[PDB]
């Protein structure tokens, strides 16, 4: 029965119940249903008008908190002598909820999510005075042509949604829409992306938002700067389906749900909850 | 034009602010909403589902032996079988539950709990248990005469294989905190203990060491507020291939 629930439910008073046939404490877990034993039906209650709002447990309010999804300190200098592995004043980033575990465990509570990403790009700068650098954050789709240089002609943004912003400005906030080809983001994808057997397991590219190619629009300055670009994603307009067990073991990788666990309890493989002495030993005991 | 002035709090990025922001892809047509089964619109739907306690959170219980409690035939009268730390917000048997893992995204919680214990002995195994929720203030009761003064349920083993120990919301305060102090009046919940009402009595062909799977859900009274990040997960370094998401 679907009903609008704004506050937690009231408790009716109850009296002495001595009745054959009606055993409300006795329930069947084997049916899979959670026990419907009301607190009135189990113990003797008073009338309580419960005014506690349930609004902070809304899945919209649960997940619409702008959490960190990307962070790169990258050097901002002459890159004529640097190696061809570091960021030559730009970084591509396939937009990925899996990189940071606080938002990842929250989004992996559910199986399917339908949200709009409210990407806030916080750029901060340190010296190896601070410059007022202008940054471009060109939104490239999944697999499309990502730039090769800082001053390459992919940054002209004929159709890719670039956002130009400065360090001295407030952080650039754009709204990435619901960009899955399916009706929800498959947070877990039990299956393979490709038709051949070489495809990566669990990684649905429909779950992938796209690339976030971020460069610094200014040319290279005679001193080098370490520019750290933090990206904050706020899921919004959130519809969520099929909740899951929250992940207890520590994450190993962003590409999959591999597990190793801690060496000892808590959150270990053989023992998730921290150990105690016996089953009849109370750890936090009020001894006076 | 319009005479304005910047307030304190201008140009600051609060993470939990709720403001309309600039659309990156204009006139975007999102994928049409399909009826996917099992929509959660409120996290208290997830909390009210039963989920197994690790009452056997000891050593020498490796992995799955932590979810069940081995009870045996006893030669002594009215013996303690197990007691359960009731700190949802702290580490203990309630932590890795649906009522526990979601409430560790919060700080203040209210409402009544719901402990369900499914006996998993033989059909020939007959026994009776008492499940005493003691409201806090004193020590964990070790004798049954001490514990049955509190809120309890006496459970016969027959056709129905589960009781519900309703843990009533007995608190002075409207909610209860996390503090890292399990012995605080604002945080401590009480003690659920279990004693042999009579005994676990099996015949010669049943196993003498039967089991108990302990569930906990929350009720419709339940409530959560003051959202925080979970202490159940951590991150020491970058995850593997997270540098390869930039390459």
């Amino acid at each position: 029965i679907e009903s609008i629930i704004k506050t937690a439910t009231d408790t009716v008073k109850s009296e002495i119940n001595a009745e054959l046939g009606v055993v409300p404490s006795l329930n069947a877990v084997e049916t899979g249903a959670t026990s419907n034993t009301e607190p009135e039906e189990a113990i003797q209650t008073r009338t309580v008008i419960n005014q506690h709002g349930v609004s902070e447990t809304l899945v919209e309010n649960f997940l619409s908190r702008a959490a960190l999804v990307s962070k790169r300190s990258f050097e901002y200098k002459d890159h004529t002598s640097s190696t061809a592995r570091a960021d030559k004043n730009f970084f591509k980033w396939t937009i990925n909820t899996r990189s940071f575990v606080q938002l990842r465990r929250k989004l992996e509570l559910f199986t399917y999510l339908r949200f709009d990403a409210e990407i806030t790009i916080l750029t901060t700068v340190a010296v190896n005075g601070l410059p007022d650098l202008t940054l471009q954050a060109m939104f490239v789709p999944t697999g499309a042509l990502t730039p090769e240089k800082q001053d390459s002609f992919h940054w002209q943004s004929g159709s890719n949604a670039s956002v130009f912003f400065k360090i001295s400005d407030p952080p650039a906030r754009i709204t990435i829409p619901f960009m899955c080809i399916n009706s929800a983001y498959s947070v877990f994808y039990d299956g393979f992306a490709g038709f051949e057997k070489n495809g990566l397991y669990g990684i649905n590219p429909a779950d992938t938002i796209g690339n976030l190619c971020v460069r610094i629009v200014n040319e290279h300055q005679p001193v080098g700067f370490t520019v750290t670009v933090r990206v904050y994603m706020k899921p919004k307009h959130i519809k969520a389906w099929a909740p899951r067990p929250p992940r207890t073991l520590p994450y190993m990788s962003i590409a999959n749900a591999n597990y190793k666990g801690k060496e000892r309890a808590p959150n270990a493989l053989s023992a998730i909850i921290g150990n105690r002495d016996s089953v009849k030993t109370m750890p936090h005991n009020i001894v006076n | 034009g319009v005479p304005t002035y910047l307030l304190p709090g201008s140009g600051q990025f609060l993470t939990t602010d709720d403001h309309s922001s600039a659309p990156a892809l204009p006139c975007f047509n999102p994928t049409p909403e399909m009826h996917i089964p099992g929509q959660v619109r409120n996290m208290l739907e997830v909390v009210q589902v039963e989920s197994m306690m690790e009452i056997n959170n000891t050593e020498s219980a490796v992995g799955m032996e932590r979810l069940k409690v081995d009870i045996s035939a006893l030669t002594d009268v009215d013996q303690l079988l197990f007691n359960i730390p009731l700190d949802i917000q702290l580490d203990g048997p309630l932590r890795n539950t649906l009522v526990g893992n979601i409430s560790r995204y919060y700080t203040h919680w209210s409402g009544s709990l719901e402990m369900t214990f499914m006996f998993c002995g033989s059909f020939m195994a007959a026994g009776k248990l008492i499940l005493c929720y003691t409201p806090p203030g004193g020590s964990c009761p070790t004798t049954r005469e001490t514990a049955m003064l509190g809120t309890h349920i006496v459970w016969d083993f027959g056709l129905q294989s589960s009781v519900t120990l309703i843990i009533p919301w007995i608190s002075g305060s409207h909610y209860r905190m996390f503090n890292n102090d399990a012995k605080s009046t604002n945080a401590n919940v009480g003690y659920v203990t279990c004693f042999m009402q009579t005994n676990l009595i099996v015949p010669s062909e049943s196993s003498d060491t039967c089991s108990l799977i302990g569930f906990i859900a929350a009720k419709d009274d339940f409530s959560l507020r003051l959202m925080r990040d979970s202490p159940d997960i951590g991150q020491l370094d970058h995850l593997h291939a997270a540098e390869a998401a930039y390459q």
Binding site: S3, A33, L58, S64, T175 | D18, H19, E45
Partner: peptide, 30 residues
């Protein structure tokens, strides 16, 4: 609340959907 954009996804978060149905989880039986 404000939403001076031309796209309905660009609005603020819809923190008003109080309709819940726990009985598809707590009582999923027929």
């Amino acid at each position: 609340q404000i939403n001076f954009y031309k796209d309905s996804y660009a609005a603020s978060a819809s923190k008003q959907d109080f309709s819940q149905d726990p009985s598809k989880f707590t009582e999923p039986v027929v």
